[PDB]
Design a protein around this ligand. Structure first.
Ligand SMILES: OC[C@H]1O[C@H](O[C@H]2[C@H](O)[C@@H](O)[C@@H](O[C@H]3[C@H](O)[C@@H](O)[C@@H](O[C@H]4[C@H](O)[C@@H](O)[C@@H](O)O[C@@H]4CO)O[C@@H]3CO)O[C@@H]2CO)[C@H](O)[C@@H](O)[C@@H]1O
Ligand SMILES: Nc1ncnc2c1ncn2[C@@H]1O[C@H](COP(=O)(O)OP(=O)(O)O)[C@@H](O)[C@H]1O
Ligand SMILES: [Mg+2]
Length: 670
């Protein structure tokens, strides 16, 4: 638990935490209340984790964008400033920390990105992004470079991506429309394409991160960088004469940075809430409190009117607010984290050359929007006492006549297939996902349910199972894409997981000590299993034959995984792609004890993993916990797409296992 009678504070490592610690010392000196300031890594991810338990800091600092999520999860206390105190802060800063009509944090300062330039290398910085390549060539001839900035965090790249029309959520009326996302529109593609072109032309390096960019600029090696107010003090102590100015325009339009309000929230589980308020209102949010923090790392444009007025003629702060005015305040809705995770992955994938700009943003768009989503769950009622069900719009309602009362259990699916609806109709939901794989976005297709429910019929029917149809579709699409300069190779692996052991179902290695280790490349997001044999697929018919034979050999008590790797190269654009389609026929889920124990653990872990992924909020994803999830790690996370068929029997006698299956389903569908 949290210690009553103390304050523990968490703030990010890039802010002036030593200055903040000074404030805590004054608070301790006056009140006897000890204040401890900490800057743990990934604290914005740890907070929701520990605070869910009733642990964590009394006070948490972060930009306002994260706080809506915390509030929706009940992790924050409503703050209670009176009107005399509210009047001391700008109204627009109070707006940033209001969620569902309630104030959920104290606003501290307004932050936006600006262009920072070396006045000696570059007396007249470029007004446009478009000039940068030529400027870089000139500087390179003096052993310098034009621009270096953090490319790992979408916060830094977004202003360019937004310039020509990109946006997170359409703003119409009160509400941000979580169904209208602007991540893959023409504006966003244009911006990201420009960024990627800079990298292709060697004006920037895909690997550049915060530390690299900072050392480069502060050492006088690059002429420009892009950063926020917190970075100024390190430049002050450097030898560089720098200026802070408006970001470059793109296609004549201003870059639009996301505007953040550094905010301080109170842990709902703190037994120190009144003390936290005294500290925040009477010590931090004062001229002297803010100056202590500001002198450590600059805050930007502070929320406190008196001190803001005092610093207003600082040209760096003026530049900050000009860029701010041109950008947009960040939404604080829980969905923002989904947005950020999605865009982070897209940018990294495009910038590194692993995926085209279009394909990267397409996948991020889907992950970030409340539409079809990344994880799709379907119920398939096998064709056939038959249970009494209705499938209204989609909802499954099962009615039991429990001697002698009427029970109605309800379950919500993306779609429900039932009597005689063919494999060809079901495959229409998987069909468009094939193009995703060809574009390098990974895909998993699971069939789940009790033995007899129809998993293998769905996945492996020799004419129209999901496997044969997927192979058929892949080859059709590959042929069409030749017209656009693409050539692809198709490789398959067929493996089985039984009681946690991997068996190559194609080439069963003979050495008894032969190991099948799952080995990830967390850089490229690739995975191989040591010693599993791969076949080069020349036709669907060929692969289907091999798989038919490989089967000629228990299946109901193990996972069967068919892994198709798609590798493309385009001779016209010189681009590359690597995508994986995983087709999984799961072990039966029905309730030999070793088998049973292992299956339950595996299936339960699968559900744990999918559920967390669906929260898209950064909760822990325990891939290690099973060979299945560990194997499929890089086709489950990121902007990967998953399809889950929950197969069920229509027989009254199977009602209990059907209900178990259906309950698993609602867990993974969120
Ligand atoms: O697993 C991947 C990574 O996940 C973690 O980072 C996430 C955050 O959890 C998300 O909250 C989000 O971050 C946003 C952030 O919310 C937003 O306020 C802004 O961050 C600025 C910040 O306002 C500013 O004050 C200053 O500190 O710089 C920040 C940017 O670095 O923008 C963020 C997005 O870039 O998204 C990220 C993922 O992109 C985790 O921390 C990472 O370690 C992890 O790699
Ligand atoms: N939707 C369906 N329509 C008609 N027959 C089916 C359907 N699903 C399964 N079957 C039949 O039921 C039997 C058992 O199905 P199967 O796919 O083996 O279940 P599981 O793999 O889940 O144990 C198979 O012989 C199959 O032909
Ligand atoms: Mg089967």
């Amino acid at each position: 638990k949290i210690e009553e009678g103390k304050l523990v504070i968490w703030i990010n490592g890039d802010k002036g935490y030593n200055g903040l610690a000074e404030v805590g010392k004054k608070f301790e000196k006056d009140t006897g209340i000890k204040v401890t300031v900490e800057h743990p890594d990934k604290l914005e991810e740890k907070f929701p984790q520990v605070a869910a338990t009733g642990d964590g800091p009394d006070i948490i600092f972060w930009a306002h964008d994260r706080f809506g999520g915390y509030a929706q999860s009940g992790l924050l206390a409503e703050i209670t400033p009176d009107k005399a105190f509210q009047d001391k802060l700008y109204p627009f800063t109070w707006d940033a920390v209001r969620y569902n009509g309630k104030l959920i944090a104290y606003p501290i300062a307004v932050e936006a990105l600006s262009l920072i330039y070396n006045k000696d290398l570059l007396p007249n910085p470029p007004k446009t992004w478009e000039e940068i390549p030529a400027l870089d060539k000139e500087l390179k001839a003096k052993g310098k470079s034009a621009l270096m900035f953090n490319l790992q965090e979408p916060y830094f790249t977004w202003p360019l991506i937004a310039a020509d029309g990109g946006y997170a959520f359409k703003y119409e009326n009160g509400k941000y429309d979580i169904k209208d996302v602007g991540v893959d529109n023409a504006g966003a593609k244009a911006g990201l394409t420009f960024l990627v072109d800079l990298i292709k032309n060697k004006h920037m390096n895909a690997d550049t991160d915060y530390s690299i960019a900072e050392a480069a600029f502060n050492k006088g090696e690059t002429a420009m960088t892009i950063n926020g107010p917190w970075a100024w003090s390190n430049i002050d102590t450097s030898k560089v004469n720098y200026g802070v100015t408006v970001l470059p325009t793109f296609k004549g339009q201003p870059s639009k940075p996301f505007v953040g309000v550094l905010s301080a929230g109170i842990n709902a589980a703190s037994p120190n809430k009144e003390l936290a308020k005294e500290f925040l209102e009477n010590y931090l949010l004062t001229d002297e409190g803010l100056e202590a923090v500001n002198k450590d790392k600059p805050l930007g444009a502070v929320a406190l009117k008196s001190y803001e007025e005092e610093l207003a003629k600082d040209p760096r702060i003026a530049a900050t607010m000009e860029n701010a005015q041109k950008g947009e305040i960040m939404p604080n809705i829980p969905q923002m984290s989904a947005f950020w995770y999605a865009v982070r992955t897209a940018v990294i994938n495009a910038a590194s050359g692993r995926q085209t700009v279009d394909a990267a943003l397409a996948a991020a768009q889907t992950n970030a929007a409340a539409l079809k989503g990344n994880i799709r769950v379907f119920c398939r009622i096998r064709n056939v006492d038959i249970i009494q069900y209705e499938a209204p719009q989609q909802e499954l309602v099962i009615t039991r006549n429990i001697n002698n009362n009427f029970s109605n259990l309800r379950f919500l699916f993306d779609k429900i297939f039932e009597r005689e609806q063919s494999n060809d109709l079901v495959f229409e939901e998987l069909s468009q996902l094939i193009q995703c794989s060809l574009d390098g976005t990974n895909v998993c297709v699971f069939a789940y349910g009790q033995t007899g429910s129809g998993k293998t019929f769905t996945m492996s029917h020799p004419t129209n199972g999901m496997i044969p149809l997927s192979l058929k579709k892949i080859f059709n699409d590959i042929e069409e894409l030749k017209e656009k300069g693409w050539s692809y190779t198709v490789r398959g692996k067929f493996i089985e997981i039984y009681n946690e052991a991997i068996v190559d179902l194609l080439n069963p290695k003979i050495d008894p000590n032969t190991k099948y280790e799952i080995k990830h490349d967390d850089i490229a997001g690739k995975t191989t299993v040591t010693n599993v044999s791969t076949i080069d697929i020349k036709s669907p018919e060929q692969a289907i034959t091999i798989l038919n034979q490989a089967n000629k050999k228990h299946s109901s008590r193990s996972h069967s995984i068919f892994i198709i790797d798609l590798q493309g190269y385009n001779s016209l654009t010189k681009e590359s792609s690597y995508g994986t389609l995983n087709l999984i026929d799961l072990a039966g889920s029905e309730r030999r004890l070793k088998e049973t124990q292992a299956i339950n653990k595996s299936l339960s872990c699968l559900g744990d993993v999918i559920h967390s992924l669906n929260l898209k909020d950064g909760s822990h994803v325990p891939y290690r916990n099973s060979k299945l999830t560990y194997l499929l790690k890089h086709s489950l996370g990121g902007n990967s797409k998953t399809l889950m068929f929950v197969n069920i029997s229509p027989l009254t006698k199977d009602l209990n296992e059907t209900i178990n299956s259906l309950r698993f389903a609602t867990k993974v569908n969120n």
